[PDB]
Ligand binder design. Sequence first.
Ligand code: K
Ligand code: K
Ligand code: K
Ligand code: K
Ligand code: K
Ligand code: K
Ligand code: K
Ligand code: K
Ligand code: K
Ligand code: K
Ligand code: K
Ligand code: K
Ligand code: K
Ligand code: K
Ligand code: K
Ligand code: K
Ligand code: K
Ligand code: K
Ligand code: K
Ligand code: MG
Ligand code: MG
Ligand code: MG
Ligand code: MG
Ligand code: MG
Ligand code: MG
Ligand code: MG
Ligand code: MG
Ligand code: MG
Ligand code: MG
Ligand code: MG
Ligand code: MG
Ligand code: MG
Ligand code: MG
Ligand code: MG
Ligand code: MG
Ligand code: MG
Ligand code: MG
Ligand code: MG
Ligand code: MG
Ligand code: MG
Ligand code: MG
Ligand code: MG
Ligand code: MG
Ligand code: MG
Ligand code: MG
Ligand code: MG
Ligand code: MG
Ligand code: MG
Ligand code: MG
Ligand code: MG
Ligand code: MG
Ligand code: MG
Ligand code: MG
Ligand code: MG
Ligand code: MG
Ligand code: MG
Ligand code: MG
Ligand code: MG
Ligand code: MG
Ligand code: MG
Ligand code: MG
Ligand code: MG
Ligand code: MG
Ligand code: MG
Ligand code: MG
Ligand code: MG
Ligand code: MG
Ligand code: MG
Ligand code: MG
Ligand code: MG
Ligand code: MG
Ligand code: MG
Lengths: 77, 95, 62, 46, 91
Amino acid sequence: SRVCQVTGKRPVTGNNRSHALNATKRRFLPNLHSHRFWVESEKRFVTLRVSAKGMRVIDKKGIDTVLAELRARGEKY
Amino acid sequence: AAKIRRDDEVIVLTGKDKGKRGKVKNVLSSGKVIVEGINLVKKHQKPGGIVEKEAAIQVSNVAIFNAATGKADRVGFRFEDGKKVRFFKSNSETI
Amino acid sequence: KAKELREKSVEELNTELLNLLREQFNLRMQAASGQLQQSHLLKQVRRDVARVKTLLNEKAGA
Amino acid sequence: MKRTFQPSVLKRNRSHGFRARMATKNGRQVLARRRAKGRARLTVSK
Amino acid sequence: MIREERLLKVLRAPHVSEKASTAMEKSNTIVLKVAKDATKAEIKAAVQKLFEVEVEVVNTLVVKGKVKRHGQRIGRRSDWKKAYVTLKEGQ
RNA sequence: UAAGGUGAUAUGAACCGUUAUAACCGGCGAUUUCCGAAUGGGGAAACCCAGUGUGUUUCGACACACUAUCAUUAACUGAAUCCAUAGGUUAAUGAGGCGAACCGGGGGAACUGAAACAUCUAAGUACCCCGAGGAAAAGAAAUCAACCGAGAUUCCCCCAGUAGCGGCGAGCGAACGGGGAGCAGCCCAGAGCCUGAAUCAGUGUGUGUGUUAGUGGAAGCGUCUGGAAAGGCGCGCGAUACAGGGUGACAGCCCCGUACACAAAAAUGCACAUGCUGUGAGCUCGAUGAGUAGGGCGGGACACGUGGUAUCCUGUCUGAAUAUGGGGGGACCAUCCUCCAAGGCUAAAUACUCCUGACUGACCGAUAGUGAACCAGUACCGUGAGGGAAAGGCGAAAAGAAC
RNA sequence: AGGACCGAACCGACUAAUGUUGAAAAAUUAGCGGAUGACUUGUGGCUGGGGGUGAAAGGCCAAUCAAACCGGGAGAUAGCU
RNA sequence: CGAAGGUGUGCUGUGAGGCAUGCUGGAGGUAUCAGAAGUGCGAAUGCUGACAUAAGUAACGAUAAAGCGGGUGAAAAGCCCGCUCGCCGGAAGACCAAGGGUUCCUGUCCAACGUUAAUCGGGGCAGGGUGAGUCGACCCCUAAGGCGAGGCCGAAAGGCGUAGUCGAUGGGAAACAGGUUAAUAUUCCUGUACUUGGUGUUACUGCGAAGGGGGGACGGAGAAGGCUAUGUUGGCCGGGCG
RNA sequence: UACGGUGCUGAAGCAACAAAUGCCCUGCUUCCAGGAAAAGCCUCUAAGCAUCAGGUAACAUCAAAUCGUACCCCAAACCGA
Ligand SMILES: [K+]
Ligand SMILES: [K+]
Ligand SMILES: [K+]
Ligand SMILES: [K+]
Ligand SMILES: [K+]
Ligand SMILES: [K+]
Ligand SMILES: [K+]
Ligand SMILES: [K+]
Ligand SMILES: [K+]
Ligand SMILES: [K+]
Ligand SMILES: [K+]
Ligand SMILES: [K+]
Ligand SMILES: [K+]
Ligand SMILES: [K+]
Ligand SMILES: [K+]
Ligand SMILES: [K+]
Ligand SMILES: [K+]
Ligand SMILES: [K+]
Ligand SMILES: [K+]
Ligand SMILES: [Mg+2]
Ligand SMILES: [Mg+2]
Ligand SMILES: [Mg+2]
Ligand SMILES: [Mg+2]
Ligand SMILES: [Mg+2]
Ligand SMILES: [Mg+2]
Ligand SMILES: [Mg+2]
Ligand SMILES: [Mg+2]
Ligand SMILES: [Mg+2]
Ligand SMILES: [Mg+2]
Ligand SMILES: [Mg+2]
Ligand SMILES: [Mg+2]
Ligand SMILES: [Mg+2]
Ligand SMILES: [Mg+2]
Ligand SMILES: [Mg+2]
Ligand SMILES: [Mg+2]
Ligand SMILES: [Mg+2]
Ligand SMILES: [Mg+2]
Ligand SMILES: [Mg+2]
Ligand SMILES: [Mg+2]
Ligand SMILES: [Mg+2]
Ligand SMILES: [Mg+2]
Ligand SMILES: [Mg+2]
Ligand SMILES: [Mg+2]
Ligand SMILES: [Mg+2]
Ligand SMILES: [Mg+2]
Ligand SMILES: [Mg+2]
Ligand SMILES: [Mg+2]
Ligand SMILES: [Mg+2]
Ligand SMILES: [Mg+2]
Ligand SMILES: [Mg+2]
Ligand SMILES: [Mg+2]
Ligand SMILES: [Mg+2]
Ligand SMILES: [Mg+2]
Ligand SMILES: [Mg+2]
Ligand SMILES: [Mg+2]
Ligand SMILES: [Mg+2]
Ligand SMILES: [Mg+2]
Ligand SMILES: [Mg+2]
Ligand SMILES: [Mg+2]
Ligand SMILES: [Mg+2]
Ligand SMILES: [Mg+2]
Ligand SMILES: [Mg+2]
Ligand SMILES: [Mg+2]
Ligand SMILES: [Mg+2]
Ligand SMILES: [Mg+2]
Ligand SMILES: [Mg+2]
Ligand SMILES: [Mg+2]
Ligand SMILES: [Mg+2]
Ligand SMILES: [Mg+2]
Ligand SMILES: [Mg+2]
Ligand SMILES: [Mg+2]
Ligand SMILES: [Mg+2]
């Protein structure tokens, strides 16, 4: 499913609104990308499906901390 | 426990045979008794003949007959020698 | 007759069980032939089999 | 003239039988409704 | 090796009929009602043990029970198994 | 607990029992086919077909147990590929499915109203989906207030159809503050000191008190009518019992009860008390939740429809200060007041009733009341989902009509 | 050889009469077209409702079709009778 | 010593109504003054049940067709037996699959069912009846297609699909003739066969798969020859002399 | 003979001719539209076992379970009340 493995961001629903304020249901999707992250501690690449926001989280916190969070949530990588 | 039992001498309180005495022959779980010589019906028996027989009477329509007093009585329950006994309410005497 | 059956070993209960099952077979055949007068024997042997099997399982364990 | 009901026990059981009902969540909801109603016959199976 | 307990349950009754009577006269064949899950092997073993006769062969069939009415209430009799047990020539 | 009993239509047959293994009632056990999550594989449910291991065998066979999947953990094994990692195998632990409502969450209509209709309404309703519990959720102020003060959350009555929102239409509709129900506060983000004392759990045994069978339980006769008396008439008696039901018409005293007084071998709830396993009180000294707050864009939520619009949530792009600091006080600024987000737990008052017991009704009484007083979710209809009836009363007693 | 010819089975359905509370909710009788093919038929399978399928008639999708059936929103709404 | 209800009759008030009482009925009823409403029916092509009308009318379901004698019986156009007649005969005969499920056979019954009567029945009731190594299923094998460990995908539900595993309408061992029951028969019996597998013995010997190859294994049309099923005629045998 | 049907006995039992849409034929000829799969079966070896097993042949012996089987089936029994 379209779920960020780092942040848990997923599709949310809302409205399109016309100029006449006609509401039609829409979705807002996360900006997801499959990305190979270098994990220096394992001498390995780990692929995560991550939002652009999740990539900024990884840049800030570091991949090792994030993967530690993933294991503790039962999030498989 | 039952106040009226098989082989008790009873007197009829109610009905066509009011006042008559007889021995209880059967106690039915419906709350009725067959009393010897009481509540006779003429059954037209298919082969065969018209046969007189006892019909069951409501157990509340008979009373234990107290031979000493010569009249209907009520039963109470007491424990004597650790065993439950019946007694006549009239005279407190064990049945 | 549980109390009297209770003072027998497993081996004695197993031979007792076989006797009852053979008796049950013979009565079943007699009832089928139209020759069993005493229909009450059928229930008696059936309940005796149950009693032996109960005690075999007690002497096994629970 | 050829009428609409043309019986086949195999097609009956595959279309509507107990195992067909159990194979999907919506089929299991059919069985739940019919149990709740107290139907003697849950499916065409029996 | 079929246990005696099992053998004591498989034979239910002799089947009494004109066909069964003729089977015994003409072909030395006894007709039995047997347990619905009795196999030919079990029936053979039971007859040999319990009636003390040599069996040649067992043929079997399942009798489907009749639908019956008992005062505007539909009912069905039970299915049961019939065994034609052919005894050997001397028996 | 017992003088009767072997459930019903439903008699009979063959029996069992009467002083205590007849039956009946309750506690604890035993047995518990096959299908069904169904789990050894398969399958058109109630069937078809295996493997493995033991044990029996009369050599024909036979019995019993185990063998699903996923998650977690552990061990062993083990690629491309060096170490490895993926993968594999086995063991242990757990899950799975079902269930009427209530509860939290993910999605989410339209008819309709606006006397048309699109904003708006209906409505975050119906419905679908996920998850939980006996309740759930919420909860210990980055809350309100107004310079006086209050002091977590939840629920009830007010405030008020007010203030507002609104094609300023139809409609939608607060809060502040007040009266009540119920009340309870804590822990981590960390060491040290002294120690493991506290309070919760778990697992034992006392101790009452309940529950799941039961026991005793008062006192009425005569006469009249009548098929029958419980009715009339006459004269008695009980009442901590005149609740109720039955009995040949309407019974306090005929029967079963009722008030009242008692009872448990066994299992089990509860409340205590007292052993035991883990949980570790208190005190000085720190520390104080960042892709976060805030912002731009798009939406949503707030009674509040973008409006002059605070506040909350975030799909997207960004991005602080971090106690000398930060949030809020309905655009915004200053001042003042007040609070401390980005970690978490927490009883009660609140919601509901598939189900169990008791009791009640100016509720129905067979076209009513459940669809169903009755063998009804049946018969019957439909490929199926699904739809879905009609149908109660002899008599006090079968004495159910011998001939 | 052949979407060749005549013609039964088989598949159709041009005309007429009958029938129209039918023998039948589409038939019967006499005639009629195709009949080695773009044929016909058995068994099983797949496509699902604004969807299918359609040598195209809005045809067909269980005697229902310009939006199936069943249950629900639901007592929609009804300035009308 | 007769409640409600039912049904008559009399009296009575301006009305809705009221009162009394005969008969039926056989156990309930309820003044007064207050209180509450599922409180009043002729209509709604209203709803349910009952019963009319048309009417003893139409019709009795292929125009293949009956006639008579005897039997049984309460009763015979319809049943049974017999003779004759007619109808089908690429079917209106026979055997099956599918589907149905006891309708099969025997005895007994005639209420209802059967478009009439019914002694008859696919009707009621009871009893009986289905026999397999070789027929079929199951089973081994796969087609379309289905499901699908992991997997990939998707707000949730779920979608797709790999290994696999299911799935016949197709591929895969073997039995025939005669006889027999009221009712089964390639299943029973008689006679004569065949298949596959497990053991044992004897002898000899390279056996061995989740792999390779072969085979299984395949269209339409047409033509000709060789045959048999089968028929016809003769011969033969038994009977016949109208 | 119980007018249902049993029971005992049994002759000839050959040839010619005609002849399928059935068989040889999953053939042959021909055409284009170019006509399942997988197992059983036969054969080959791999790893492995190796005076073992296994294989093949003959003979003997045992086994072949379970479920269906009545009856209608162009129809009064199925689909059409
Ligand atoms: K609307
Ligand atoms: K309007
Ligand atoms: K009296
Ligand atoms: K009485
Ligand atoms: K009373
Ligand atoms: K932000
Ligand atoms: K401040
Ligand atoms: K009803
Ligand atoms: K539609
Ligand atoms: K009256
Ligand atoms: K009153
Ligand atoms: K009317
Ligand atoms: K008439
Ligand atoms: K007639
Ligand atoms: K077989
Ligand atoms: K099988
Ligand atoms: K002549
Ligand atoms: K058969
Ligand atoms: K058939
Ligand atoms: Mg045989
Ligand atoms: Mg068989
Ligand atoms: Mg399974
Ligand atoms: Mg299984
Ligand atoms: Mg669960
Ligand atoms: Mg409008
Ligand atoms: Mg909570
Ligand atoms: Mg202050
Ligand atoms: Mg008592
Ligand atoms: Mg008393
Ligand atoms: Mg009375
Ligand atoms: Mg903080
Ligand atoms: Mg903020
Ligand atoms: Mg923000
Ligand atoms: Mg802002
Ligand atoms: Mg914004
Ligand atoms: Mg907004
Ligand atoms: Mg502000
Ligand atoms: Mg009703
Ligand atoms: Mg009535
Ligand atoms: Mg042509
Ligand atoms: Mg056409
Ligand atoms: Mg024609
Ligand atoms: Mg032409
Ligand atoms: Mg032609
Ligand atoms: Mg048109
Ligand atoms: Mg149609
Ligand atoms: Mg539409
Ligand atoms: Mg609505
Ligand atoms: Mg309406
Ligand atoms: Mg009314
Ligand atoms: Mg009326
Ligand atoms: Mg009117
Ligand atoms: Mg009429
Ligand atoms: Mg007329
Ligand atoms: Mg006329
Ligand atoms: Mg006429
Ligand atoms: Mg006719
Ligand atoms: Mg005649
Ligand atoms: Mg008659
Ligand atoms: Mg005729
Ligand atoms: Mg004739
Ligand atoms: Mg029948
Ligand atoms: Mg018949
Ligand atoms: Mg008639
Ligand atoms: Mg019949
Ligand atoms: Mg799939
Ligand atoms: Mg398979
Ligand atoms: Mg097949
Ligand atoms: Mg036959
Ligand atoms: Mg020939
Ligand atoms: Mg031809
Ligand atoms: Mg047959």
